[PDB]
Amino acid sequence: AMRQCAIYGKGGIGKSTTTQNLVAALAEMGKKVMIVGCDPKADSTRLILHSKAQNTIMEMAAEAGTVEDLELEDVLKAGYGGVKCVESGGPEPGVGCAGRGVITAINFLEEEGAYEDDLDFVFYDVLGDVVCGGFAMPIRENKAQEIYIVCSGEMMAMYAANNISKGIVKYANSGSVRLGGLICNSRNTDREDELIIALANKLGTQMIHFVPRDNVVQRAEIRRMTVIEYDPKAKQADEYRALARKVVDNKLLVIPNPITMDELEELLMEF
Amino acid sequence: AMRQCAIYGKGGIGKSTTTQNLVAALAEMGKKVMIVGCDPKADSTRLILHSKAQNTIMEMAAEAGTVEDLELEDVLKAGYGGVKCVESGGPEPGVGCAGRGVITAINFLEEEGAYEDDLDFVFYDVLGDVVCGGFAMPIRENKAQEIYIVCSGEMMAMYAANNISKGIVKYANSGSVRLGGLICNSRNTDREDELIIALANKLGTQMIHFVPRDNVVQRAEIRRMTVIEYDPKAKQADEYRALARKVVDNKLLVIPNPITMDELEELLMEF
Amino acid sequence: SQQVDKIKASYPLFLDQDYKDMLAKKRDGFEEKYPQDKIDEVFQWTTTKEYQELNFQREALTVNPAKACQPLGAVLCALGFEKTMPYVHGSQGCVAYFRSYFNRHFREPVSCVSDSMTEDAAVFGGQQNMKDGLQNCKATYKPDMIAVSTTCMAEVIGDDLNAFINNSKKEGFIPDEFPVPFAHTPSFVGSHVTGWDNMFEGIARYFTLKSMDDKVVGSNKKINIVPGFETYLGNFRVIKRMLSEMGVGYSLLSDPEEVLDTPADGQFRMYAGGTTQEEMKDAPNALNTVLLQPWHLEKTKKFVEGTWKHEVPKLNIPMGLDWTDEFLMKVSEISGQPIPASLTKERGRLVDMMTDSHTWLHGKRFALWGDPDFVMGLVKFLLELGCEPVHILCHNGNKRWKKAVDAILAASPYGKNATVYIGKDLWHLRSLVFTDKPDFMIGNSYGKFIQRDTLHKGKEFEVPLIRIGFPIFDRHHLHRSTTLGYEGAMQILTTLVNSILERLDEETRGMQATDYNHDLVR
Amino acid sequence: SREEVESLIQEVLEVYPEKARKDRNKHLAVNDPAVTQSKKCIISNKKSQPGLMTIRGCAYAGSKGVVWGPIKDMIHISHGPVGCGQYSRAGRRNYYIGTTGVNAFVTMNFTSDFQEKDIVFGGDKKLAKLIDEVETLFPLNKGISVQSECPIGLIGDDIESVSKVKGAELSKTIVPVRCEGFRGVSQSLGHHIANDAVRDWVLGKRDEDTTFASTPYDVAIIGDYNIGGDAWSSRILLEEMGLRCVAQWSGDGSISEIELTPKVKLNLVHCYRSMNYISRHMEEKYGIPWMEYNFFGPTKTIESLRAIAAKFDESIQKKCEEVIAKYKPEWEAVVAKYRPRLEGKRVMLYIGGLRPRHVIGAYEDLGMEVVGTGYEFAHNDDYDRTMKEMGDSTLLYDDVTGYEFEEFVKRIKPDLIGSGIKEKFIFQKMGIPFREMHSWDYSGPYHGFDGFAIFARDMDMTLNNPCWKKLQAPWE
């Protein structure tokens, strides 16, 4: 009865910030949740743990010789509201293989059983530019069953979400992973919500929520805290709580239908 | 006289957009320039070519069997102002290995004789999340000599810049690769310019320019047309000309040195 | 049961009755093995032409290939230089396999090292791995040079060999003046010969690219010879012997003769002979460079012509009669020295042997395979002998090589029934030898199974194998042989004629049945 | 002397740099049979130091070359580039009976022949096409095993999905094995991965089937790979004792034997190192006990036969006594003929996970003294086992390097060395007799009474060969 969700999207669209605030809101109402960050630069758990540097799976495995000698306790770290946090880790940019890093980290979490029979939600915060099968690790069989794409009313996010749906369709046909919704992080350009709704209808999914660009989150990110940890009476806190409620109350899971670039031409020539 | 430059940064900051408008401005000045796209999404030269993509090296190499039998003129096409455009291409997200594709495309360009056309500038458009050495190929020996990082006044943008510098220092001590400048994209955030120049003069680099957030850029990519072509009479389309002028004149090539975030935190108390 | 007087190994100890009953009981009880008639009819189906049509439609499955990966050739090239160590940046299993392969072929010690990169090295890169490996190798085995190749593991992740080596030199793991040439040898591109070419190009670049300001072509009155991927020591021997008989000064780059031919005199020698570094730095000063196997020395040719400025001759492999004559004449033209009477007499002896053996050689049909240059040389020599090549297979060949061999076949009348296959494995050759039976096969030990296959169909369908090529595992000391030059042509002629005569003797050994043709004089 | 061996170790390690010397000092020990915890004397199962000429393999060798390869009715696909399957083709003498190319495929090399387009774009569709071609071209196969190589693990191909889909579609058992070489440090993790694959995809298929008739004398050999016919020589003794053997793992082994194994009464494990995991899993899931046995030399074979017979009723014990009585004169004659020529000669061993300790008793049965033994990839438990079989003040080396082994042989000066092909010619050039202990020098079998005679004959023919008296020229 443990639900598994993956957070995908374009680089810099707000995957990690929204994911961490969402899991904080989920822990507020009281379900145990896990975060697995498949980003080599290890920023998926900064806000929850209030720490800049932690013990990722790969650096600990390098210290311990092999991944077979790693212990889950040395890499599992609790945080606010009992949320469990683990980081795949990886190399500094420009060397090695991040995708193999995600592969090995997820394989370890699955062999050394980390999904204890207490978790209600497990989120996989994925890297923005999925360029190999390793970053498609979270969405294979016996893994994340729902996928949420973070987008915005710009050509960047629209095109990236379309390509990500193109990538997902093969796993959806081969397995049982589905698109549970689209989250849009507003850049406040023009008519954002209508464009996101139009793209969701074209693909066959729904707009999960509209989270406006609020500078307060930046302030919270100043001190390694989520907005929930800040003054909870802020509007963005209520927006994140509403997003958590809607995510809990999600039923619609479809196989996405990618569109051709001409369809994006038609959508662009609509506003 | 053939200067080789590579544009790095975080995903979503505006590499491709900035690189394409800068190349258009340079071609308007009268400098022949060739763009090499090392992103499997294949969108680094869509504004210059007025089309999504013609023929990537990896698609053509796969269709023709091997890259050994491929010809130069088949994959590379000229756009506005004689801008000589080629793109590595790659697989759809979630499958394959795009880094090997970039490696093979660059090796093909070198062996065929792409950098022998009396070119003045060769600009490498690389994706923000450098996850392997294949995407560090543009900064190997005899490859791009100046690196420009594009980052706005964001926490993770300034942290992605530091991580990229950490990746750079490995290649800077074993070759002639140096960090040529720090291009600053905008988010219309309060006191962005002063914080960005604080980073520039605390990193040992120089702030080259600050490009404002103008809606014309998003109003020009819909018509797959560069801002120079859309309207060379606005406040913008001359900011890019100034950036081009300061790029041709930049002579500060300084090895980067990563900074500590706590001290970096002080800059927020400044702004 | 074993008798201490006559102890039996596996054959024929497993032919006794009790072992037969044990095997039969196990088969009938626990294998659930298919009925024998099903097996016979499936084998018969595999021998047909419908199975051939299905087999040649293969697009994704490769069965029993006839090639290896690039780092094997890289190791072979690195072993041809004086006190040079083949270092492979990647996994240790690759080096173990290369060492076992070359040990089984040459029956000689083969030295090669790896950094033994593990999963953490895959994730993080092999910079520290190469630093430690270079320091350890230099400290322990004391080489004068380390030649670095790559495995597929390192080639996928984009390991920058240049940056890693420069960083290792900068941090003090190796001396700055210690030569560490490198080459990228991806195993998913080309084959072992491509790795040899890449390693040689890397060594040549390292030793010559930055010091071409005081080099004049033809200053040292010598001719560079690049042998390529060669696994017959006799070939190096014959090339050097013929060049010395002409009096021609030469520099045989990548000479692995001595390290693969060390004597058993009580001590072990890790390094022996080899091309010296002074010969490599002086290579551009030579009159010209001659490539013995040009069809896999393409990058080397490009580098030599574009940097050394040597007008490389367009010569085929010096194999057979005509191509050996062309090689000798071209060397004479380059060096200005006449061909001596000894080589003319040797050519006369070879022609005499062809004249003697033409009766038994004419009209015989051969299915052959191997490396491109060696295969094309065999095709040419067989055409000169009157033989008929019918199935020519080169797994690591390209379209241009196909066109060249097609032209060679079209020149001769003994190539009207010749087909050339590129990209096909030994299962395709099995189908071909079943559907279009040749008299013999010419290849490496991997062909023996094909022969076995044919013998299962019948004694009249058996296609004997002649072992020329790489690798030879089930025969001893055949790497000593020579295939190049007149001596090589003589050896090949003797092997082919004696194989035909031995087959005829086997066919005529039946008393009162076929012994009327069992002639003492042949 | 213990001090002499310690001084030799220190002198040998003096040449290494600091970190390499520190690492290697823990892999060289002097034996003391009174010690039951070898981790206090030696350290095992660690990554090899870079650039030191190790003789270790990879996980691919441990999985495809060792465990899965001998299974004759299967077709094994070396997923990835061409080199691995070619280097591993028919290099191991795992003997089998069958019609090759029709119902047996041990000596044949199936590969996907990866190119660069398969790396950049993937190889799942190519793998599915390969499965279709394998089915249409070899209809009599009983299953497929996809062994992964390094690029497959790097680029994250989903071979499990292809295996599941094509197995559902074609009603065939397709086993995906992730035996990429960069995983682990040696062949041992390949053994582990292969055993897990057998457990997950093959073992539990006749779990709700009662068709098989189970005699109360059902045994299975686990970890015997029929190197030159060893498994057959052991099986003849096992059946002569009255025991019915259902499965052989995995030399000359079919798929059906593997699936019928969970119905046996005893698991006779020869190679503990490679099959202990599946033995423990069978004990936990099905309750089948497993015991170790050694069939090297007459003494060990007799002890093992009595040990196996002790777990059955009196009829099997009587048949066991009859078997020893019958085979006594043969091995007594072998000893009488060969021990005089092999008495007092000293043997140095360096083999992989099991044989450095299993073949010792055979050497003592011929009057041979083992002055030093060592493993390639064995863990600490194997070392606990071998310290009680080696004599006092004897060298123990784990993951020895070429330099270390060379210097050890130069100082110790043994009469015979038993190791692999990567060191055979090195020591043959030093005037030291060498016996290939992985391939029996293309001879054998050596297991059982029938193999003891061949073992004695081979050791005699190599140690006493006249060629070792002619290396020095009379003028030098």
Ligand SMILES: Nc1ncnc2c1ncn2[C@@H]1O[C@H](COP(=O)(O)OP(=O)(O)OP(=O)(O)O)[C@@H](O)[C@H]1O
């Ligand atoms: N609602 C918001 N208001 C303001 N800034 C935001 C908001 N959401 C995210 N950001 C900022 O956007 C930047 C990128 O967000 P985030 O780090 O979540 O990106 P990501 O897509 O997870 O990263 P990547 O794709 O690079 O792996 C950060 O500076 C973050 O603080």
Ligand SMILES: Nc1ncnc2c1ncn2[C@@H]1O[C@H](COP(=O)(O)OP(=O)(O)OP(=O)(O)O)[C@@H](O)[C@H]1O
């Ligand atoms: N100065 C600007 N003002 C307004 N819009 C801008 C500006 N610069 C870029 N944009 C808009 O932002 C987008 C630029 O995204 P772009 O693909 O160039 O980023 P990127 O850094 O290449 O991202 P990635 O690395 O993820 O591919 C375009 O939609 C463009 O119109």
Ligand code: ICS
């Ligand atoms: S499986 Fe192992 S290295 Fe136990 S990988 Fe190796 S055919 Fe050795 S000491 Mo070759 S653990 Fe078998 C072995 Fe022993 S291949 Fe053979 S001889 S008894």
Ligand code: CLF
């Ligand atoms: S450690 Fe083992 S043997 Fe090595 S590759 Fe890796 S699985 Fe295989 Fe293979 S084709 Fe050649 S031999 Fe390698 S470089 Fe790749």
Ligand code: SF4
């Ligand atoms: S593209 Fe992915 S799989 Fe390929 S090297 Fe980079 S991180 Fe590894």
Ligand SMILES: [Fe+3]
């Ligand atoms: Fe020899």
Ligand SMILES: [Mg+2]
């Ligand atoms: Mg992120």
Ligand SMILES: [Mg+2]
């Ligand atoms: Mg871009």
